[PDB]
């Protein structure tokens, strides 16, 4: 069976940590709270099988998400406070994130409101920002990756498809991996890099303001042939400023796509209210932005 330990000692830094509630999974991982036994302060526990690990790419997979992630410190990323092992797991320490993801958001909200769109994209994009200066290409941003804190914060998680480029002007030709927004470069395999993460948040930026993803079908593989063809529609209720941007991002050709640092300077940020932040009540309720209490 192979059990996870109720208390996860990590032998170079001395720090216990006791294993709480559990959150979820998701791959070959599980997530709990953890809390450090000193400080009594919590995280986000990753914690991996070495069983599911006995073959050496798969391994690799995980050291480099780990040398990624690791190296990585923003204020919309997700922290990465440590990591450490015994002969049975891989344990990852990370910044615990209590209101789950935009997943969950969406779900239950389906179309946000435009104040809301803008509010947690910027905060995607600067995220994303962070990691396309620091060279990083995530290759698997998605709504079930961008986690939110208490305060409804944006953190930037799952680097397990993340790539670093080495070079200037390097093409990946390969993505080991099934992204979710997976771009039309990486579908056809003809060479890919930082624009395929522009595309996602495209896709992102899609699916918070008309509330269904922009490519979905009954066959994943009838929506890759549609992500091929450049098959979608935006609906003529979204604002035609909102609409301009989303077609700037989900160009066939990467090279047409807006970077990630020319993004916040589009109309769609500019010329609109951007919440300095958003009330709890946001999850379930749509806000009305009202001036006064009345
Ligand atoms: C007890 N309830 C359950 C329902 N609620 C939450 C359910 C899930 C979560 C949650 O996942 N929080 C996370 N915080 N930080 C992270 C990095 N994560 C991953 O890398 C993703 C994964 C790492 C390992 C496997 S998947 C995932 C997180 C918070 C609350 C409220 C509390
Ligand atoms: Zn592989």
Redesign the pocket.
Same mark, same amino acid.
């Given at each position: 069976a192979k059990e996870i330990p109720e208390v996860l000692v990590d032998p170079r830094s001395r720090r216990r940590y006791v294993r709480g %509630?559990?959150?979820? !999974? *998701?791959?070959f991982? !599980?997530?709990f709270?953890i809390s450090d036994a000193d400080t009594k302060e919590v995280?986000? *526990? !990753?914690?991996?099988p070495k069983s599911l690990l006995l073959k050496p790419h798969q391994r690799e997979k995980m050291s480099m998400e780990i040398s990624i992630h690791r190296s990585l410190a923003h204020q919309h990323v997700?922290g990465f406070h440590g990591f450490f092992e015994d002969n049975d797991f891989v344990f990852?320490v990370?910044?615990?994130? %209590?209101? %789950?993801?935009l997943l969950?958001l969406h779900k239950r909200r389906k179309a946000l409101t435009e104040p809301e769109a803008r509010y947690y994209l910027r905060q995607i994009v600067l995220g994303c920002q962070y990691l396309h200066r620091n060279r990083v290409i995530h290759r698997d941003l998605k709504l079930g &990756?961008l986690?939110l &804190?208490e305060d409804l914060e944006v !953190?930037i *998680?799952?680097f397990g498809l993340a790539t670093k480029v080495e070079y200037d002007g390097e093409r990946k030709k390969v993505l080991c991996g099934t992204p979710n927004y997976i771009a039309p470069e990486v579908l056809s395999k003809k060479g890919h890099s930082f624009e395929v993460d522009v595309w996602s948040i495209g896709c992102i930026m899609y699916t918070l303001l008309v509330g269904k993803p922009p490519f979905e079908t009954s066959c994943l593989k009838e929506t890759y042939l549609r992500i091929k063809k450049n098959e979608y529609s935006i609906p003529k209720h979204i604002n035609p400023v909102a609409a301009s941007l989303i077609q700037k991002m989900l160009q066939t050709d990467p090279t047409a796509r807006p970077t990630i640092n020319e993004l916040l300077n589009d109309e769609f940020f500019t010329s609109g209210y951007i919440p300095a932040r958003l009330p709890i009540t946001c999850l379930t309720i749509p806000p009305r932005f009202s001036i006064a209490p009345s």
């Open positions: %509630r559990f959150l979820g !999974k *998701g791959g991982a !599980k997530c709270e995280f986000a *526990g !990753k914690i991996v997700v990852v990370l910044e615990l994130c %209590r209101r %789950r993801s969950e &990756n986690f &804190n !953190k *998680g799952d």
